[PDB]
């Protein structure tokens, strides 16, 4: 009583989920220091 383990299990019934389904939510957090960028997309570096 008044002493509960603070964790619970979701479950995700196989097909009973309309808003009750596993949604593997990957989140990208884009961190820039105005430093050397390092992860940037496929641009062709033309001459200067």
């Amino acid at each position: 009583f008044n002493c509960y383990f603070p964790l619970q299990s979701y479950g995700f019934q196989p097909t009973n989920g309309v808003g009750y389904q596993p949604y593997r939510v990957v989140v990208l957090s884009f961190e820039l220091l105005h430093a050397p960028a390092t992860v940037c997309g496929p641009k062709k570096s033309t001459n200067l």
Partner: antibody, heavy 126, light 111 residues
Framework: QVQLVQSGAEVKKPGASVKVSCKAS????????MHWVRQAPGQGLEWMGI????????SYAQKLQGRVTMTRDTSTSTVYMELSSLRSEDTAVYYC????????????????????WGKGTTVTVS | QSALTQPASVSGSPGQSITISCTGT?????????VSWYQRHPGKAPKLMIY???NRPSGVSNRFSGSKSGNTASLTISGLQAEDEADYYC???????????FGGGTQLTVL
């Protein structure tokens, strides 16, 4: 009188397939799950997999690939248990088990509470 | 995971209290709150007394209590009798390949 009944015992030799039933009584057959536990000789109790009376969706233990297919009958409230390519250790007492909550929408309570039981049904394979 | 660890056999006396240990993995007992115990009267069916570690079905005598810490689950029988002599199996949900694990079992012999 909510009670679960399988068939009698079976006597198999290796490589066959076996048919185990389990009828239900005293409740709404489409609400709870049907869990299945055996007892290998000398080692403890062992769950296969389950089937939903609402839709028939199946699943089972990885160690039991292709050697098990669980079927059911809503009209007679009977659920059926299959085990092919039988081996010597398949000698076990096979139980049918009912989940301790009704299938509920948007649910939280987990559906592996094993609370309602069959008499038991021993398999003999040699 | 693998089968849980239970004592092979524990003896005692009527009215005295005996406790039964159940060790597993952090993925068997320590990650979850889902420990349930069972008993075997010889030649009979299982019977559930323990589930939700310390919670109970209706009709189980207040003599049996369950406890939880670390990798250890435990069952305590207060006010023992020859009425209590049976086999005892702890059960838990696992966060791995399987879903349910059982202990090796414990025979409680009343002397």
């Amino acid at each position: 009188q909510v009670q679960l009944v399988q068939s009698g015992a079976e006597v198999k030799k290796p490589g066959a397939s076996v048919k185990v039933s389990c009828k239900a009584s005293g409740y709404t057959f489409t609400s709870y799950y049907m869990h299945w536990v055996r007892q290998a000789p000398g080692q403890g109790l062992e769950w296969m997999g389950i089937i939903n009376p609402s839709g028939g969706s199946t699943s089972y233990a990885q160690k039991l690939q292709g050697r098990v297919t669980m079927t059911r009958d809503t009209s007679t409230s009977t659920v059926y248990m299959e085990l092919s390519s039988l081996r010597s250790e398949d000698t076990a007492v096979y139980y049918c088990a009912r989940a301790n909550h009704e299938t509920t929408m948007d649910t939280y309570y987990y559906y592996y509470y094993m609370d309602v039981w069959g008499k038991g049904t021993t398999v003999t394979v040699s | 995971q693998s089968a849980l660890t239970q004592p092979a056999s524990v003896s005692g006396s009527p009215g005295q209290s005996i406790t039964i240990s159940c060790t597993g993995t952090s993925s068997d007992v320590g990650g979850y709150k889902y420990v349930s115990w069972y008993q075997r009267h010889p030649g009979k069916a299982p019977k559930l007394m323990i589930y939700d570690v310390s919670n109970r079905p209706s009709g189980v005598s207040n003599r049996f209590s369950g406890s939880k810490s670390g990798n250890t689950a435990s069952l305590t029988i207060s006010g023992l009798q020859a009425e209590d002599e049976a086999d005892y199996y702890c059960s838990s949900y696992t966060s791995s390949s399987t879903s349910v694990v059982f202990g090796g079992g414990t025979q409680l012999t009343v002397l």
